Design a protein around this motif. Structure first.
Motif, PDB file in Angstrom:
ATOM      1  N   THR B  61       0.866  -1.173   0.000  1.00 34.53           N
ATOM      2  CA  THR B  61       0.000   0.000   0.000  1.00 34.53           C
ATOM      3  C   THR B  61       0.901   1.222   0.000  1.00 34.53           C
ATOM      4  OG1 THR B  61      -0.095   0.400   2.388  1.00 34.53           O
ATOM      5  CG2 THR B  61      -1.662  -1.198   1.464  1.00 34.53           C
ATOM      6  N   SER B  62       0.293   2.397  -0.063  1.00 31.20           N
ATOM      7  CA  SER B  62       1.063   3.619  -0.077  1.00 31.20           C
ATOM      8  C   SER B  62       0.141   4.815   0.037  1.00 31.20           C
ATOM      9  CB  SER B  62       1.898   3.688  -1.363  1.00 31.20           C
ATOM     10  OG  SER B  62       1.126   3.397  -2.518  1.00 31.20           O
ATOM     11  N   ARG B  71      -3.234   4.075  -2.539  1.00 39.32           N
ATOM     12  CA  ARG B  71      -3.041   3.011  -3.504  1.00 39.32           C
ATOM     13  C   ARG B  71      -2.762   1.695  -2.778  1.00 39.32           C
ATOM     14  NH1 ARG B  71      -2.690   3.405  -9.130  1.00 39.32           N
ATOM     15  NH2 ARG B  71      -2.164   5.415 -10.095  1.00 39.32           N
ATOM     16  N   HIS B  73      -1.397  -1.937  -3.649  1.00 40.59           N
ATOM     17  CA  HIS B  73      -0.659  -2.646  -4.681  1.00 40.59           C
ATOM     18  C   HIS B  73      -0.882  -4.146  -4.789  1.00 40.59           C
ATOM     19  CE1 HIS B  73       1.080   1.231  -4.088  1.00 40.59           C
ATOM     20  NE2 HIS B  73       1.900   1.093  -5.112  1.00 40.59           N
TER      21      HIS B  73
END
Lengths: 111, 109, 110, 118
Positions: B61-62, B71, B73
Motif C-alpha cells: 500500500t502507499s 493506492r 498494490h
C-alpha cells in the motif's frame, strides 16, 4: 461491538447518579447521549485513567477495562430520562462504534 | 464508491475527504480498514506507523497525501471487498472522528 | 557497494543502511532520499513527513519504515533503474549537520 | 375488567407517591372496592383497601397509609410516608361488588421508585 450498562438506576437525594457503562483497544471515547436525543457530556481517555470532560461539565468518570464508571452530577427532576452511553474505539485502528440502549435515570424528585 | 481494478494490478481506495478546516496530517490520524476491521495503512500524527497493520496489507500500500487517497498494490483475489477511510482529529480534549467514507473493491481477474 | 534488483511494476526497498549509534529519534533528525538527478522521493522531517519538496514521480508510491529506516518504492518503472542515496542530517539548534549518507543501486528487471 | 395505571411513578422526598388507577365503570349505581397491593421478590401483600360509591372520597378506615378520591373510570390513590425499601410494583386491584354481576379486574402495577430518603 456491544455496549451494555445498568438496567435502571436512581440518583441520590442530592442529584448524583452513577451507572457502569461497559464495552467489548486503548483510547476509548464515551459520549453520553439522552432520549429527542442530545449530548450530555463526552471524553477521551487512555486504557485505565480518570476521565476528563472539559472542566465545567456535569460528569465524572473513572475506567478500568471493558467498563467505565460514569457519574452525572447536579441532576434534578426534569433531567430524568434515558441516558444513552455511546462508546467509540478510537486510535489505534481499527475503529468500532458500539451503542447502548441507555440506562434510565430517575431523578424527578428534588429535595 | 465502487472502483474496479484488475488482478495483480493496483487499486486506488480514495478517502474522499476534503479538508475544510485546513489541517495537517499531524493534528490528524488516518487509516483504512476492510470488511473485517483489519488494517491496511495508518498515518499517525504525520508519520506512518505499522504497529497495527495486518499481514495481508503490509508492504503493498502507499499513501498519497495529495489526494488523501491510498493506492493498494499487487491486488489479490481476496481483496475484492469493502474498505472504509477514517480520520480523527486528535485535539487536546481528545481524539474525535471527523470523517469516514466507504468504498467497494471489485478485482477483475 | 550494495545494488538491489526489483522487477517492473513490483516494489523496491531502498535501505538507508544507517545504524543509529547515538540513539536518536526521527524527531531530532531529518531524513530524505534522492536519485541520480537530485530528485526527492520521500522526506521525514523532525518526525513527521513533509512532501513540500517531493518530485511528482515519487509521490504516492513510497513508504517509510522507521523500523529498518528503509523506504519501499512502489510500482517500479523502467526509468527508476538508477542510483539512489539516503541522507540524514541532525537538526541541532546550532543548525542542521549531515550525519549519514548511503548509496544504493537499483536494477529493474523487466 | 381492564384496570390500567401509570407506567411508573416516583414518590416525593417525603414519601408521598400518588398514582391513577382506572377501570371500566358500571352502568348502574354501584359499590367498588379498590385494594392496593405490592410485590417484593414476589411476596405479595396488602397495602390498603377501600370501598367507595361512584364519585366520592375514599374512606380508608384502614387508617392505613392511603388517601384516595374517585370520579368515573378511575380513582386517584396516594400512598404516604414511603421510604427507600418500599419501592416496588404496587399492583392496583379493582373489584366491582354489589349490585350484580361481579367483576374482578387487576392492573400490571405501577412501579413506584422511592429508594431515596432525605
Amino acid at each position: 461491538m456491544h455496549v451494555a450498562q445498568p438496567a435502571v438506576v436512581l440518583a441520590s437525594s442530592r442529584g448524583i447518579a452513577s451507572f457502569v457503562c461497559e464495552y467489548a483497544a486503548t483510547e476509548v471515547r464515551v459520549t453520553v447521549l439522552r432520549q429527542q436525543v442530545t449530548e450530555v457530556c463526552a471524553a477521551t481517555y487512555m486504557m485505565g485513567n480518570e476521565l476528563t470532560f472539559l472542566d465545567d461539565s456535569i460528569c465524572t468518570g473513572t475506567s478500568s477495562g471493558n467498563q467505565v464508571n460514569l457519574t452525572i452530577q447536579g441532576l434534578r427532576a426534569m433531567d430524568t430520562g434515558l441516558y444513552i452511553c455511546k462508546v467509540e474505539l478510537m486510535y489505534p485502528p481499527p475503529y468500532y462504534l458500539g451503542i447502548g440502549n441507555g440506562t434510565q435515570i430517575y431523578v424527578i424528585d428534588p429535595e | 464508491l465502487k472502483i474496479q481494478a484488475y488482478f495483480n494490478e493496483t487499486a486506488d481506495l480514495p478517502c474522499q475527504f476534503a479538508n475544510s478546516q485546513n489541517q495537517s496530517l499531524s493534528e490528524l490520524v488516518v487509516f483504512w480498514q476492510d470488511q473485517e476491521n483489519l488494517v491496511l495503512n495508518e498515518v499517525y500524527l504525520g508519520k506512518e506507523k505499522f504497529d497495527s497493520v495486518h499481514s495481508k496489507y503490509m508492504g503493498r500500500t502507499s499513501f498519497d497525501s495529495d489526494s488523501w487517497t491510498l493506492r493498494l498494490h499487487n491486488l489479490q483475489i481476496k481483496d475484492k471487498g469493502l474498505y472504509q477511510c477514517i480520520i480523527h482529529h486528535k485535539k487536546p480534549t481528545g481524539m474525535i472522528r471527523i470523517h469516514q467514507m466507504n468504498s467497494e473493491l471489485s478485482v477483475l481477474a
